[PDB]
């Protein structure tokens, strides 16, 4: 429930590892990668001169 930068994502995986275990952490990492890729592509971000 916040804007997830790069430090707010690593702490999420660390919390998952410390609370749950190893298998949920692996599945969570794969799902995080998939969702991040999908919505980064869907956002249509770019870079211009303006």
């Amino acid at each position: 429930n916040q804007a997830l930068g790069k430090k707010a994502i690593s702490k999420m995986l660390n919390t998952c590892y410390r609370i749950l275990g190893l298998k949920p952490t692996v599945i969570f990492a794969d799902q995080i990668m998939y969702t991040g890729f999908a919505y980064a592509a869907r956002s249509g971000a770019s870079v211009g001169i303006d």
Partner: protein
């Protein structure tokens, strides 16, 4: 297949003894005449051995006891 071996490590207790126990059981299943204690699902001998270790069916003491029993029965049968 499988992705993690954490349960087998917890049951055996050490990550270096698990490899040896699993190798012993997998060699028993592969080059010997043994058959898996769990339903094999298109799996190889190493993964079957790991799945047997995960359920408390295989460890060093069980293997030693079964080997001694097999040797005693074979020596009795040969007479």
């Amino acid at each position: 297949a499988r992705v993690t071996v954490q349960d087998a490590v917890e049951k055996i207790g050490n990550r270096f003894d698990l490899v040896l126990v699993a190798a012993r059981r997998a060699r028993q299943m592969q080059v010997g005449g043994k058959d898996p204690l769990v339903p094999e699902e298109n799996d190889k001998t190493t993964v079957i051995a790991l799945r047997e270790i995960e359920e408390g069916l295989i460890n060093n003491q069980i293997l030693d006891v079964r080997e001694r029993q097999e040797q005693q029965e074979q020596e009795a049968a040969e007479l």
